[PDB]
Design an enzyme around this catalytic site. Structure first.
Site, PDB file in Angstrom:
ATOM      1  N   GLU A 175       0.829  -1.202   0.000  1.00 46.57           N
ATOM      2  CA  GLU A 175       0.000   0.000   0.000  1.00 46.57           C
ATOM      3  C   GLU A 175       0.871   1.262   0.000  1.00 46.57           C
ATOM      4  OE1 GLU A 175      -3.317  -0.397  -0.180  1.00 46.57           O
ATOM      5  OE2 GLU A 175      -3.676   1.756  -0.386  1.00 46.57           O
ATOM      6  N   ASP A 176       1.651   1.389  -1.074  1.00 49.63           N
ATOM      7  CA  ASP A 176       2.468   2.574  -1.336  1.00 49.63           C
ATOM      8  C   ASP A 176       3.531   2.794  -0.257  1.00 49.63           C
ATOM      9  OD1 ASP A 176       1.185   3.175  -3.730  1.00 49.63           O
ATOM     10  OD2 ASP A 176      -0.350   4.379  -2.733  1.00 49.63           O
ATOM     11  N   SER A 177       4.444   1.837  -0.146  1.00 48.19           N
ATOM     12  CA  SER A 177       5.621   2.022   0.694  1.00 48.19           C
ATOM     13  C   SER A 177       6.845   1.477  -0.024  1.00 48.19           C
ATOM     14  CB  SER A 177       5.448   1.338   2.043  1.00 48.19           C
ATOM     15  OG  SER A 177       4.413   1.952   2.778  1.00 48.19           O
TER      16      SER A 177
END
Ligand SMILES: [Mg+2]
Ligand SMILES: [Zn+2]
Ligand SMILES: [Zn+2]
Ligand SMILES: [Zn+2]
Ligand SMILES: [Zn+2]
Lengths: 34, 257, 64, 44, 49, 528, 39, 117, 477
Positions: free
Chosen positions: I155-157
């Protein structure tokens, strides 16, 4: 004298000439001198 | 229910890399010694800087950082040095440290390069790797630099300035005889350097009752330790970890009563 | 601003190869051949020199 | 204490409650001289 | 900066080559501030004499 | 004036009576952490060493508390105040000798926030009651809030520079009511639509689909390594599915240990051919579809969003209805940990080999595009001789526009189907689309086949110049390419005139979202 | 601090008469001088 | 300072002890060792050796959190064997393997003092 | 052609743009005039006699890539991304740290960020030579792998290499300036820089005043921490009532340099600059050149990252789920093009509408250096040394470090200072005040049914109070 297939190199030479003379902020410097 | 008899065979040997092959062992052991070449081999490096006069272009914490990453000759006297947290002295002593000194001043008009030939030590056993020259800073007419540094001992879990190796190659099973990896189109893949296949084949035939053996290594070096004492100091360092853990264990199941 | 002393990925020492790199491009070498004459064979250590901009030579123009 | 001119870099002790000007240069921007108590860094 | 009328915010056909089509901020000022293209040149004026 | 002193918003009646500024609260960034239970949160040590909790002294906790008061504001697990019975609030930072301080029954120590405490955690806009839930503290080294991933769906969060607040209940009654009313395992199903709000999420879903295929066999060492991560394991190793040539376990055989209790469920996978229940093989399913969970063990079927996500009748919904709220927590945590520790053996990626097609498909796409651009020309040139007949309730222009849209929409669909039926089983786009983790079946065709036809204000690209769209066309050109039909793919790149029309469509799609937020927020505030 | 603590159940409004205004005020006779302090 | 110093990852504190034994009560002849200040380098080298013993039923390890430094090892043996026995017999077999490989290596590097070819 | 072979010689020929307009080969065209014109987009392709679209072309474009602004012409292959993505990056490359001006030593700006080791891209657009992006760059070419490794990049890391951060990766510095001006506001009320002594001055705190010199200013070089006094300024009382300036909390800077001079109205004033070094940690925000922002999830050492068959570990690992939903395929080609540029030694070309660089022409160039022709590689697991069943897509890309760091966004309050008139929690110079408990939060608690927690948050946590009330009448007593 026609430019064929040397167009891609030629167009960048004309774009380079415009940026060398006008620059990127000639917008601001010319309305003030006026 | 017992150990194996591994056999080593060296292929190349230079002053900056070793190529060898370890047959007849298990994958977990051939990997646990791949992580020790990197992390847990001790080495010397600068870890304490104090600046007296810095009028250069880079600020003080820039130069204190480009100094720690300079590799020092750690060949033989790493075994005689204590850890500065174990030694019974004060903050510093010649039993757990090595003192350096730099002092440069630019007077001519032409610019000046402050190389690593200026790091002057007191112990003739630990010097930067010069026997080109790493650049530290450039100075202009009227600027100067002078400092004092100590060089401690540690390994690569503290900081990445204490690991002694460049890239460490490692690979096994050059042809998918085990199908550990699965190619969708096995024809577009270049053939490995160690392969023994024909020029018109892609993979060896699958064999189910197989097991990974004959691991291939290639250990380079940054310049501190010779490439063959990086390996000897790793096996002698991993053995001494298990040998110390067995002490704590037998001390536990003995005090069980 | 100044050539790093170590490649960020490998750890190989690069900080001593900037003047020799300019010296090879000086005569006739292509960037692809000058990097091979120095011993940089992984593409992570060639990115170090190929894409470096040297800003320290422009901060030495201001009088101290 | 001791101040450094902003143009000629000639140190000159300016006394408390005194005008701020150089000498031999006549300038009005002064930089305080670096301290002499020492601080230690880490190469880390 | 909060009027919901879309016609002063949408991209118009006549912006070809004189205002950048992709560059604009989000939020409440969408399409209200704009940046001009690379070769676009604004005139300075003269006398019709 | 006095009536001017108590005005509306920011007066004295609407700015300081119900909405104010509180203490005992913190704020910072959030980052993921798959090793935490769904009811825990990770707090840095600089925030935890600042917020306190008053703890009454009783002969059950006198020694521990005087030990805590020995070390104050220097060691982390300490204390910073003593409140005796008289109301005297003494400060440990200034007291000269701490050892003289003798705690007594009735006193009240002001402890440092330690592990196991209870907090309240919300995100920037609070829309429904799931945007504020009670977590449990667990203290970690660095300086960001850390929380699990399956809980990002209720908060509607994502880890690109987001921020969240926490408030710390000070009393004990408030602590008990937060504990028995609003803890996050108690809010799995929502009363808004009677379906769960937390399901398996972005990365675990793609792997769960691959882990439960018909052909996934594990050796002995890998099975042991996976069982090491089960928190509810009884301690027995099940008998392998293949015992002879050599023992091998299966994916479903290991997944059957995660499923709690003895539950029952029947779902379908997202690629179930509808003509399978008709003929034979209704209970055999060559494609391994029709998930069947009988007596708490996976017998057959592949798992996906239709069977593990947030829909009514899912596996998590049934496990919540039958087993309770304290076992579904373990269900979530076990699924996540086991599947991640297998995924680092299996691996996953996306490249450009997964965005390219063979030579045959390109020719087919070119042919169908050419034929569509042909048909449009016949329609145009037969409308220029007044041979069109309007339909009831349709102008002559609008009938023409409606037909030109039908020809062009069918090409986007027929080309789209060509892009799919040429994909491979190893493709990584199909692997995220099938499992339902991220993407849709139209992005595949837009990347591989055709971007399609742009349109502003719900209609074709207008004549912004006079009788033209750009100074590169001739006047009154009604063709497909001259009014917005982008016939390339994102892999082959767009030509300038198509780049511009794409920018127009994107711009309108970007403005609508900017309006929507304010509109909906205001109307909801009024109604509530 | 010596009197008991209790809840509120009803709030009644109304205008207050000059009678109680004079009776419960604190500065008897009234404020007369427009200047606040003198020394 | 909200970041731990680098030496906390391998350097033991004063009160801590490197190894701790607990008996698992769910099944007979099971044990659970908890080594402190350790990681995958040592965790994995042990597990592979225990599986080579024909008298061990279970063996595995996990690092419960990558941001703390601690591992856990679980062992289960046949009823005529002890988990503490199987553990210490594994270690003495690694040491007998490394010290052997060091001899065969030091011979191979001095096998070309001048060169074989 | 006569105009080109004499235009490539402007250096010693005095023939330039102006001599090109005055010869009647180019012409400025307004917007109104642009409705009576017929344009061709490219000469060699639109001005050939055939069964042709038009035959009365009046003008021709120079290059169709000049329709983009300044911040949007640094994106490689922008004609392969979805449209809203190009809008995000153009509003995101405006807050990427780099070096902003060459004489940053003189300027005492407030809030200046500077990167240690900037690098120029390996895949460049041809319209970046004219805006000086190879002389003041902002970013570093990192080796990125697109894979799911341990779940910390979901999730966007991003996961990033810890022992590359220790060699200078994305390290930077941070400057900040403070002003103080001595002033004579009254004929007796006068300020002055001096070292406040405890028995004479009165309004001071108990903080230490030893770092100050006789002047009242700190000499450069000392290590000033949070809650230290830096400027000692005493006001004379109608004895001496001192003021001063203190730091904010949690700076841990080092005093860079101190300047003393006279401002406009002639009052003596000083400026002080504080230096502080910022190493990347696990809250910081990193972004690519195609609208993919994301924080940092965890940092692994080199002995734990996955390696290739010759020891090349990636510096950054990103989630594969970020691609299929937003369709940034320009991100997947510049890491394929970048891998050819490092092996050949050139620097790539990503001008938008080139039509001379396919993917089939880049892939066939890559299989010559002995790699798979789509970028994939065989990675080994770092913990157990086993091979990974899938092949991971790896290559070099150009990342930037955004301005939003986590050291600046953390704050907490627990029984802090309060106001005076309304006795509501106040922040003031404390830096950490309270978080507002708005109206929408007052309703989630009502729906929850929690009546105690709703009372605590509004009354017992914020301005508690007691009054006395009469019994017969309802007036305070
Ligand atoms: Mg967000
Ligand atoms: Zn010493
Ligand atoms: Zn390298
Ligand atoms: Zn002077
Ligand atoms: Zn009364």
């Amino acid at each position: 004298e026609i430019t064929p297939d040397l167009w891609q190199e030629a167009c960048w030479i004309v774009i380079s000439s415009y940026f060398d003379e006008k620059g990127l902020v000639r917008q601001q410097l010319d309305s003030f001198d006026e | 229910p017992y150990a194996n008899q591994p056999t080593v065979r060296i292929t190349e040997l230079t002053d900056e890399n070793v190529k060898f092959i370890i047959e007849n062992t298990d994958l977990a052991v051939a990997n646990s010694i791949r992580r020790v070449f990197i992390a847990e081999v001790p080495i010397i490096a600068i870890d304490w800087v104090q600046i007296d006069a810095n009028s250069s272009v880079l600020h003080d914490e820039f130069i204190a950082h480009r100094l720690g990453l300079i590799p020092l000759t750690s060949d033989d006297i790493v075994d005689k040095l204590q850890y500065s947290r174990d030694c019974t002295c004060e903050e510093f002593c010649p039993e757990c440290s090595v003192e350096f000194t730099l002092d440069v001043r630019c007077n001519e008009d032409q610019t000046r390069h402050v190389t690593s030939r200026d790091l002057i030590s007191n112990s003739p056993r630990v010097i930067p790797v010069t026997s080109d020259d790493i650049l530290i800073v450039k100075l202009r007419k009227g600027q100067e630099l002078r400092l004092r540094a100590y060089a401690k001992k540690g390994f690569g879990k503290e900081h990445a300035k204490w690991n002694p190796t460049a890239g460490v190659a490692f690979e096994y099973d050059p042809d998918n005889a085990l199908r550990h990896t699965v190619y969708p189109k096995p024809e577009e893949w270049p053939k490995s350097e160690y392969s023994e296949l024909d020029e018109d084949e892609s993979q060896a035939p699958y064999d189910p009752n197989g097991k990974p053996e004959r691991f291939y290594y290639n250990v380079e070096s940054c310049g501190s330790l010779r490439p063959e004492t990086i390996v000897l100091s790793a096996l002698s360092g991993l053995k001494k970890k298990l040998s110390d853990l067995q002490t704590q264990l037998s001390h536990e199941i003995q005090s069980d009563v | 601003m100044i050539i790093p002393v170590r490649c960020f990925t490998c750890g190989k020492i690069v900080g001593n190869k900037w003047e020799a790199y300019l010296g090879l491009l000086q005569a006739e070498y292509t960037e692809g051949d000058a990097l091979d004459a120095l011993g940089l064979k992984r593409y992570c250590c060639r990115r170090m020199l190929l894409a470096h901009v040297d800003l320290i030579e422009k901060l030495l123009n201001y009088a101290p | 204490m001791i101040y450094i001119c902003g143009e000629c870099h000639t140190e000159n002790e300016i006394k408390s409650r005194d005008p701020i000007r150089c000498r031999e240069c006549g300038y009005r921007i002064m930089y305080k001289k670096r301290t002499k108590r020492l601080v230690v860094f880490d190469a880390r | 900066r909060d009027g919901k009328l879309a016609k002063p915010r949408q991209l118009h056909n006549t912006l070809w080559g004189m205002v950048c089509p992709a560059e604009t901020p989000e939020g409440h000022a969408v399409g209200l501030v704009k940046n001009l293209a690379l070769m676009a040149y604004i005139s300075v004026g003269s006398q019709p004499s | 004036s006095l009536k001017q002193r108590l005005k509306g918003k920011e007066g004295r009646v609407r700015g300081n009576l119900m909405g104010k500024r509180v203490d005992f609260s913190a704020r910072t960034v959030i980052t993921p952490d798959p090793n935490l239970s769904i009811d825990q949160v990770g707090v840095p040590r600089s925030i935890a060493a600042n917020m306190t909790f008053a703890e009454i002294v009783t002969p059950f906790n006198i020694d521990r508390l005087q030990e805590l008061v020995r070390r104050g504001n220097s060691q982390y697990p300490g204390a910073k105040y003593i409140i005796r019975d008289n109301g005297d609030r003494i400060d440990l930072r200034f007291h000269p000798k701490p050892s003289d301080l003798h705690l007594q029954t009735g006193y009240k120590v002001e402890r440092h926030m330690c592990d196991g405490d209870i907090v309240i955690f919300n995100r920037q806009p609070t829309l429904h009651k799931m945007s504020m839930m009670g977590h449990r503290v667990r203290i970690l080294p660095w300086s960001t809030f850390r929380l699990n991933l399956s809980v990002t769906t209720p908060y509607n969060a994502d880890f690109d520079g987001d921020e969240m607040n926490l408030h710390l209940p000070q009393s004990l009654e408030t602590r008990a009511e937060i504990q028995e009313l609003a803890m996050v395992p108690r809010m799995i199903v929502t009363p808004q639509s009677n379906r769960p709000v937390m399901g398996i999420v972005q990365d675990t879903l793609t792997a769960v689909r691959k882990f439960t295929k018909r052909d996934v066999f594990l050796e002995r060492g890998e099975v042991m390594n996976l069982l090491m991560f089960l928190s509810t394991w009884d301690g027995k190793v099940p008998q392998p599915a293949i015992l002879k040539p050599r023992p091998l376990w299966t994916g479903k055989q290991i997944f059957s240990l995660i499923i709690p209790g003895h539950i029952n469920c029947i779902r379908t996978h997202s690629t179930h051919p509808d003509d399978e229940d008709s003929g034979p093989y209704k209970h055999i399913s060559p494609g391994d579809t029709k998930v069947v969970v009988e007596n708490g063990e996976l017998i057959m079927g592949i798992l996906c969003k239709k069977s593990l996500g947030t829909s009514a009748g899912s596996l998590v919904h049934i496990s919540y209805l039958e087993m309770g709220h304290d076992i579904t927590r373990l269900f979530y945590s076990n699924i996540q940990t086991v599947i991640n520790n297998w995924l680092l053996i299996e691996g996953h990626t996306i490249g450009i080999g997964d965005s390219i097609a063979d030579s045959k498909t390109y020719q087919d796409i070119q042919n169908t595009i050419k034929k569509a651009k042909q048909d449009v020309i016949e329609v145009i040139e037969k409308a220029h001789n007044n041979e069109l007949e309007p339909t009831p309730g349709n102008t002559l222009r609008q009938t023409f526009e409606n037909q030109v849209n039908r020809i062009l929409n069918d090409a986007r669909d027929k080309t789209g189907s060509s892009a799919q039926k040429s994909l491979s089983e190893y493709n990584n786009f199909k692997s995220m689309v099938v499992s339902g983790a991220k993407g849709s079946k139209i992005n595949i065709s837009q990347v591989i086949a055709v971007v399609g036809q742009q349109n502003v204000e719900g209609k074709r690209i207008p004549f912004g110049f006079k009788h033209r769209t750009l100074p590169h066309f001739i006047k009154d050109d009604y063709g497909p390419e001259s009014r917005g039909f982008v016939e390339n793919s994102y892999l082959a790149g767009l030509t300038p005139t198509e780049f511009f029309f794409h920018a127009m469509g994107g711009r309108e799609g970007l403005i609508d979202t900017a309006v929507k937020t304010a509109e909906t927020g205001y109307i909801q505030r009024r109604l509530i | 601090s010596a009197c008991p603590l209790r809840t509120i159940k009803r709030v009644q409004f109304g205008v207050l008469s000059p009678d109680e205004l004079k009776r419960m005020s604190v500065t008897e006779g009234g404020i007369k001088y427009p200047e606040t302090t003198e020394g | 300072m909200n970041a731990p110093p680098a030496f906390e990852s391998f350097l033991l504190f004063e009160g801590e002890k490197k190894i701790t034994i607990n008996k698992d009560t769910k099944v007979p002849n099971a044990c659970l060792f908890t080594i402190n200040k350790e990681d995958h380098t040592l965790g994995n080298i042990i597990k592979s050796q225990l599986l080579k013993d024909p008298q061990v039923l279970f063996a595995g390890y996990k690092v419960p959190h990558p941001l703390e430094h601690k591992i856990i090892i679980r062992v289960q043996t046949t009823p005529d064997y002890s988990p503490q026995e199987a553990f210490t017999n594994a270690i003495t077999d690694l040491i007998s393997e490394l010290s052997l490989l060091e001899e065969r290596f030091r011979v191979a590097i001095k096998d070309k003092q001048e060169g074989i070819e | 052609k006569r105009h080109i072979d004499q235009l490539k010689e402007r250096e010693y020929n005095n023939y330039s743009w102006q001599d090109l307009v005055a010869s009647g080969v180019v012409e400025y065209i307004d917007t109104l005039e642009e409705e009576t014109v017929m344009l061709a987009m490219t000469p060699d392709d639109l001005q050939e006699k055939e069964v042709a679209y038009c035959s009365t072309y009046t003008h021709c474009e120079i290059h169709p890539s000049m329709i983009l602004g300044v911040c949007a012409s640094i994106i490689p292959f922008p004609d392969h991304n979805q449209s809203p993505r190009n809008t995000y990056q153009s509003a995101m490359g405006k807050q990427a740290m780099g070096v902003y001006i060459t004489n940053f030593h003189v300027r005492m700006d407030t809030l200046a960020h500077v990167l240690y080791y900037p690098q120029k891209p390996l895949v460049t657009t041809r319209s970046m030579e004219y805006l000086r992006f190879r002389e003041l760059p902002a970013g570093i070419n990192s080796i990125v792998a697109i894979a799911s490794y341990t779940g910390y990049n979901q999730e966007d890391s991003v996961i990033m290499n810890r022992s590359a951060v220790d060699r200078g990766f994305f390290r930077s510095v941070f400057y900040r300036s403070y002003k103080e001006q001595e002033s004579k506001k009254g004929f007796d009320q006068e300020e002055v820089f001096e070292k406040p002594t405890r028995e004479t001055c009165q309004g001071m705190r108990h903080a230490i005043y030893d770092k100050l010199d006789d002047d009242g200013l700190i000499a450069p070089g000392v290590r000033v921490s949070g809650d230290d006094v830096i400027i000692g300024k005493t006001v004379t009382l109608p004895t001496k009532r001192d003021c001063s300036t203190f730091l904010r909390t949690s700076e841990t800077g080092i005093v860079d340099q101190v300047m003393v001079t006279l401002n406009q109205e002639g009052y003596k004033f000083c400026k002080i600059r504080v230096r502080s070094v910022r190493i990347p940690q696990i809250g910081d925000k990193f972004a690519s050149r195609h609208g993919q922002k994301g924080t940092c999830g965890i940092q692994y050492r080199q002995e734990d990252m996955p390696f290739t068959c010759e020891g090349i570990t990636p510096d950054i690992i990103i989630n594969p789920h970020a691609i299929p939903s937003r369709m940034t395929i320009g991100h997947l080609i510049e890491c394929l093009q970048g891998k050819v540029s490092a092996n050949k030694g050139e620097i790539g070309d990503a001008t938008p509408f080139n039509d001379a660089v396919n993917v089939q022409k880049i892939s066939n160039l890559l299989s010559d250096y002995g790699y798979h022709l789509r970028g994939n590689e065989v990675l080994y697991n770092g913990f157990t040394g086993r091979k990974i069943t899938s092949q991971i897509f790896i290559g070099p890309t150009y990342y930037q470090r955004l301005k939003h760091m986590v050291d600046d966004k953390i704050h907490s309050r627990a029984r802090g200072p309060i106001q005076i008139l309304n006795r509501q929690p106040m922040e003031g110079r404390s830096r950490d005040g309270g978080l507002r408990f708005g109206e929408m939060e007052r309703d989630c608690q009502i729906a929850h049914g929690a009546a105690q927690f709703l009372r605590e948050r509004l009354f017992e946590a914020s301005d508690p109070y007691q009054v006395h009330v009469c019994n017969l009448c309802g007036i305070m007593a």
